[PDB]
């Protein structure tokens, strides 16, 4: 009756930590009620159930019927979390008195009765390292700074109210956050209380060093890395396992291998008699600390690709295509993981959610048009099945052509005027115009078949959430204009720069495309002959000519002196513009790259920004 609704309150308030609720639903204390005063029944939970960190009390089977005019009996199960874990299968029983009560030692945990005790020990796990393929730590344990306030030290009265008003607008709290965390209950005078992590004290606030989590590159690799947080119950929902207090991976690789990083923290919760004898184990773990993953990803790379896209929006991807060894995945701009990780106001997370850049996306797992770039992928193809002629020139007046009126007011668009283009000349300039002509003298049969020697439809083997690469929307064009859009990397193509620089492989490779690997010990995958070798010796020289032209697109990379095969490119939606460049050491296969600046301004260019790093590159990946 009313009985189903004080066991169900009663429940609720020790599930919100509210143990002073909690009591005061509790029977008298008397032989035919409650075993303690409602004082001791505070203390008890206190110390049980806040030394375990008992959070998620949820039962069932709730019984309930009469026994006396004055009592009525309640039975149900129960399944709660700790800092051990769950437990669960817990079957509680007792009665009610009028409502309120009969509180009994068996109400902490089923087979207490007494002067039984709990004892609870613990030994922590450690979370496995994220690192580099040097050693660098990507994700690791930090030496960090708390603040926090000795109550017995800010002062007595007004004094105290205004050293927490200072302390709360000078390290950005409320006030009324200090004072919950100085209340709580088992806080104590001279106890250091921690109020916050950060990167002039009022009285009584102090600075303590401890340990957490810890991004050396912030920003520069937080969309690959991740951030961890504060388990909540809908985690241990989905995973028993889970502890009630630990962290868990929300995002990046610290979500993708939460499991492998965060071992198992273990100890023992158990029942003993007032002396400590073992009366019952309720929970037993042997701790296991976590495995440290070891990645491709060369931190200094990863930082420089990072600092490069100057806070702009765009992508950076460099590898060792040979072996396929992922060295930077940069997407910019970023978001601060370690203020993710720590103290995040609602004021700040709704700002990175506003942004419309939108530095929570990973734009290196994200597909795009690879852009004009795309034109050597239907180069290589079309020199393969002989639709193209190197030899061969094309008229080309002009900076816009259009196959007939039925394009409307649609044209493909090049930048400059030189009227007689070869393959060459196309890859020097980047002229677009060529390349359409060429595709929709190919044919869709001619450039599907080609294409479908890379990694459309793949799913790479890959720990980073991302969509297969794709073609069109369909399966076929069923558009002239969509085919020879598609030949110089518009359309509907969507490759994501880490799908780019796999297929961009092959100029590497001698016509094998090499797959992406981020794991440092994980096996070379590769696929023969995707093209062929024909294409790969006219292509790469051209490539060469990008950089050493004094006209070719890529011309100022020229002046570094550093051996380099590049084509740059755009992508252009309907009047935003995407900017790319690939770019790779011809002679020694060292190194590749692919960068994109997304919704470029005006004068910026992924090329104008790409030097330091093709230094850094060309200096330590021969």
């Given at each position: 009756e009313a009985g189903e609704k004080t066991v169900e309150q009663f429940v609720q308030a020790l599930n919100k930590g509210d143990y002073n609720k909690?009591?005061?639903?509790?029977?008298?204390?008397?032989?035919?009620?409650?075993?303690?005063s409602e004082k001791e029944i505070l203390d008890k939970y206190q110390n049980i159930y806040g030394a375990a960190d008992v959070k998620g009390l949820q039962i069932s089977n709730?019984?309930?019927?009469?026994?006396?005019?004055?009592?009525?009996?309640?039975?149900?199960?129960?399944?709660?979390?700790?800092?051990?874990?769950?437990?669960?299968?817990?079957?509680?029983?007792?009665?009610?008195?009028?409502?309120?009560?009969?509180?009994?030692?068996?109400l902490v945990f089923p087979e207490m009765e007494g002067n039984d005790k709990v004892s609870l020990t613990t030994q922590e796990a450690a979370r496995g390292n994220i690192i580099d393929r040097n050693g660098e730590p990507l994700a690791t344990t930090g030496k960090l700074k708390q603040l926090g306030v000795v109550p017995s030290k800010l002062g007595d009265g007004g004094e105290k109210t205004a050293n927490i008003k200072a302390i709360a607008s000078s390290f950005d709290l409320t006030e009324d956050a200090i004072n919950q965390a100085i209340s709580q209950?088992?806080?104590?005078?001279?106890?250091?209380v921690p109020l916050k992590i950060?990167?002039?004290?009022?009285?009584?606030?102090?600075?303590?060093?401890?340990?957490?989590?810890?991004?050396?590159?912030?920003?520069?690799?937080?969309?690959?890395?991740?951030?961890?947080?504060?388990?909540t119950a809908e985690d241990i929902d989905k995973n028993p396992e889970l502890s009630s207090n630990g962290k868990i991976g929300r995002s990046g690789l610290e979500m993708?291998?939460?499991?492998?990083?965060?071992?198992?923290?273990?100890?023992?919760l158990s029942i003993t008699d007032a002396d400590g004898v073992e009366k019952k184990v309720l929970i037993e773990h042997e701790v296991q600390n976590g495995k440290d993953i070891k990645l491709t990803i060369d931190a200094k790379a990863q930082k420089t690709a990072f600092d490069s896209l100057g806070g702009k929006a765009g992508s950076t991807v460099a590898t060792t295509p040979k072996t396929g060894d992922l060295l930077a995945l940069a997407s910019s701009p970023s978001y601060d993981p370690n203020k993710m990780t720590n103290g995040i106001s609602q004021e700040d997370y709704k700002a990175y959610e506003e942004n419309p850049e939108q530095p929570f996306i990973s734009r290196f797992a994200t597909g795009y048009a690879p852009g004009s770039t795309f034109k050597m992928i239907t180069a290589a193809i079309g020199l393969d099945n002989g639709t193209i002629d190197p030899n061969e020139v094309l008229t080309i007046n002009g900076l816009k052509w259009q196959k007939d009126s039925s394009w409307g007011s649609y044209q493909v668009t090049r930048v400059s005027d030189v009227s007689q283009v070869d393959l060459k000349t196309a890859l020097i300039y980047s002229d677009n115009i060529y390349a359409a002509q060429e595709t929709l003298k190919m044919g869709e049969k001619k450039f599907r078949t080609g294409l479908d020697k890379f990694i459309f439809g793949e799913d790479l083997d890959l720990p980073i959430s991302m969509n297969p690469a794709q073609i069109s929307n369909e399966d076929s064009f069923n558009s002239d204009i969509l085919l020879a859009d598609t030949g110089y990397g518009q359309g509907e193509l969507l490759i994501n720069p880490i799908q780019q620089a796999a297929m961009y492989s092959v100029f590497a490779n001698n016509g094998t495309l090499v797959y992406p690997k981020l794991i440092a010990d994980k096996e070379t995958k590769d696929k023969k002959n995707v093209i062929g070798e024909t294409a790969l010796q006219t292509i790469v020289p051209d490539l060469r000519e990008v950089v050493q032209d004094v006209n070719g697109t890529a011309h100022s990379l020229s002046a570094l002196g550093i051996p380099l095969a590049a084509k740059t490119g755009t992508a252009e939606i309907k009047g935003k513009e995407n900017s790319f460049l690939f770019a790779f050491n011809p002679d020694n296969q060292g190194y590749?790259?692919?960068?994109?600046?997304?919704?470029?301004?005006?004068?910026?260019?992924?090329?104008?920004?790409?030097?330091?790093?093709?230094?850094?590159?060309?200096?330590?990946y021969q």
């Open positions: 909690a009591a005061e639903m509790t029977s008298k204390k008397a032989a035919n009620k409650s075993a303690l709730l019984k309930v019927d009469k026994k006396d005019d004055s009592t009525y009996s309640f039975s149900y199960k129960a399944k709660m979390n700790t800092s051990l874990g769950e437990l669960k299968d817990l079957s509680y029983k007792g009665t009610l008195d009028r409502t309120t009560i009969n509180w009994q030692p068996n209950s088992w806080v104590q005078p001279d106890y250091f950060i990167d002039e004290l009022p009285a009584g606030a102090t600075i303590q060093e401890v340990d957490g989590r810890y991004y050396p590159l912030g920003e520069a690799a937080a969309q690959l890395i991740g951030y961890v947080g504060d388990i993708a291998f939460d499991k492998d990083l965060r071992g198992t923290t273990g100890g023992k590749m790259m692919v960068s994109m600046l997304e919704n470029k301004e005006d004068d910026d260019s992924a090329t104008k920004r790409a030097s330091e790093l093709l230094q850094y590159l060309n200096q330590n």
